[PDB]
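PROTEIN ENTRY
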Amino acid sequence: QEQDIVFLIDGSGSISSRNFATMMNFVRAVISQFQRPSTQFSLMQFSNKFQTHFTFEEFRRSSNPLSLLASVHQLQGFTYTATAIQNVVHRLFHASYGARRDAAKILIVITDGKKEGDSLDYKDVIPMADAAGIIRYAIGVGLAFQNRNSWKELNDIASKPSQEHIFKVEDFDALKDIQNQLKEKIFAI
């Protein structure tokens, strides 16, 4: 079963250079657990700005896909998670970007904090993501995601059942600890 998977990663200034590098190592590790052509990937980074590092078409045609993750520079800035999801949902899965009609559409969001200053609300972008059948995973990095204020954030982003689509890790160095878990979740789709 074909899968078109988008990684949407936060590049806000709150993320240290060391942690950003660690996050990219995690993305590379997860991608390395899958094989083309069944699974294809696309990567967008967000802050208050948005950058598509590679589309599904670029990943598909590449003779060395993992290299497309070699020159990813951190954007810095704020964290407009809702608008970022909107940008992914309304662009990265287009046929013109290399997406496949019959493929399962999956979005993996990695963030170190709640959205702040975003002019869009989750209720403004999630309903459409659900209509498109986009399966969403929310990965929250930081002890703050242990409370309620930040917990609800992951629930608003992730597909239901929430528990099966959310991951809370204490720090960026702990991302590697959920690689197998995340892989198993996706392989089950």
